[PDB]
Amino acid sequence: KLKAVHHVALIVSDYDKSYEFYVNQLGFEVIRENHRPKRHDYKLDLKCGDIELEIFGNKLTDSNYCAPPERISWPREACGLRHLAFYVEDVEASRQELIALGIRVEEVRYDDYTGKKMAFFFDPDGLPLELHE
Amino acid sequence: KLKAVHHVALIVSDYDKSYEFYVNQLGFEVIRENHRPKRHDYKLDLKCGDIELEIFGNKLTDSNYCAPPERISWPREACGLRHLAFYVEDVEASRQELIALGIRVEEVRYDDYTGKKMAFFFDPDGLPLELHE
Ligand SMILES: [Zn+2]
């Protein structure tokens, strides 16, 4: 009886640069932020509607820093979670906002089955994110 | 103004086996199912409260089948989307039912930053999924 998503987690390579992206550029509100010292990890918990986004990452300055492997994008993406789409009122306007922040967003396309406007953009590690009406 | 998650997409190696897992064992409602050879092969859209899960994969019998790479799980998971957690009223019971279906569920543990029960299980391609109170 799986009622609702509780949270979606993601991995990032540079915790600082990604914090700046998710919190300061994309504007997500921070619920909590915790250092997990014997994980060589930080856990950053963001609010997105009624679910949480958990961002896991290390700072480049950490003494035990090891960069995670890069995401597989070509020729084929791997099995597992592929991309995350956010619901917005105005894809065109949110698209412009992103672009104003210096984030590149691909051209507006239409959902294949609903016709709703949508547009892809990428987090610093190339994670495909989507704006979707 | 990223209001909510619209959908989360994932890739599976064996479309029939993953359709069985998600739709028949986990009981997700099918919203749509569409086949566009090559463009996106099979795209299976599932309801999970207010968010859709978009499952992408291809059937082993398809004449142009190419298995996607395996999810990287060891020693370090890759950058990108990591795992997905679902809200359940009763983790203990939900875990019971899953095991009864023949899905292996790891021991019940407690959330570190709340003390709420949770448990991991895995999809046929090793995607970590989580039950959470
Ligand atoms: Zn999508």
Q: Where are the domains of chain B?
A: 7-133
Kindly determine whether residue B1 and residue A50, on different chains, have CB atoms separated by under 8 Å: no
Checking phi first, is residue B28 left (phi over 0); if not, alpha (psi -120 to 50) or beta? Answer: beta
Instruction: State the DSSP H helix or E strand holding residue B6, giving kind and residue range, or none if neither.
Output: strand B4-11
- A7 marked ligand binding residue: yes
Nearest to A48 among B2, B7, B72 (CB): B2
Query: Which chain residues have CB less than 5 Å from ligand 1, an ion?
Result: B 9
Nearest CA-CA distance, residue B1 and chain A, Å: 7
**Cα gap A96→A86, rounded to integer Å:** 15
Task: Count CB atoms within 10 A of the CB of residue B58.
Answer: 23
Instruction: State the DSSP H helix or E strand holding residue B105, giving kind and residue range, or none if neither.
Output: none
Kindly determine whether residue B88 and residue A3, on different chains, have CB atoms separated by under 8 Å: yes
Q: Which amino acid, residue A13? A: S
- On whether the CB atoms of residues A50 and B85 are closer than 8 A, the answer is no
Kindly determine whether residue B68 and residue A77, on different chains, have CB atoms separated by under 8 Å: yes
Greatest Cα pair distance, chain A, in angstroms, is 49
**Cα gap B41→B56, rounded to integer Å:** 7
**Cα gap A94→A112, rounded to integer Å:** 20
Q: How was this structure determined?
A: X-ray
Q: Which is nearest to B72 in space by CA: B125, B4, B6, B8?
A: B125
- Tell how many helices (H) and how many strands (E) occur in chain B: 2, 8
CA-to-CA separations, A33 to A30, A111, B133, in angstroms, rounded = 7, 35, 20
- A35 marked ligand binding residue: no
CA-to-CA separations, B73 to B15, B47, B126, in angstroms, rounded = 21, 27, 8
Measured between beta carbons, which residues in chain A are less than 8 angstroms from residue B130? 6
Nearest CA-CA distance, residue B106 and chain A, Å: 17
Kindly determine whether residue A6 and residue B45, on different chains, have CB atoms separated by under 8 Å: no
Nearest CA-CA distance, residue A16 and chain B, Å: 14
In this structure, which CATH number among 3.10.180.10, 3.40.640.10, 3.40.50.1110, 3.40.50.1950 belongs to the domain A7-133? Answer: 3.10.180.10
**Cα gap A97→B106, rounded to integer Å:** 43
Kindly determine whether residue B81 and residue A127, on different chains, have CB atoms separated by under 8 Å: yes
Which two structure tokens, joined as six digits, stand for B21?
């897992």
Q: To what resolution in angstroms was this structure determined? A: 1.8
**Cα gap A52→B5, rounded to integer Å:** 10
**Cα gap B133→B24, rounded to integer Å:** 23
For Cα atoms A11, A14, A18, give the angle at the middle one, nearest 5 degrees: 75
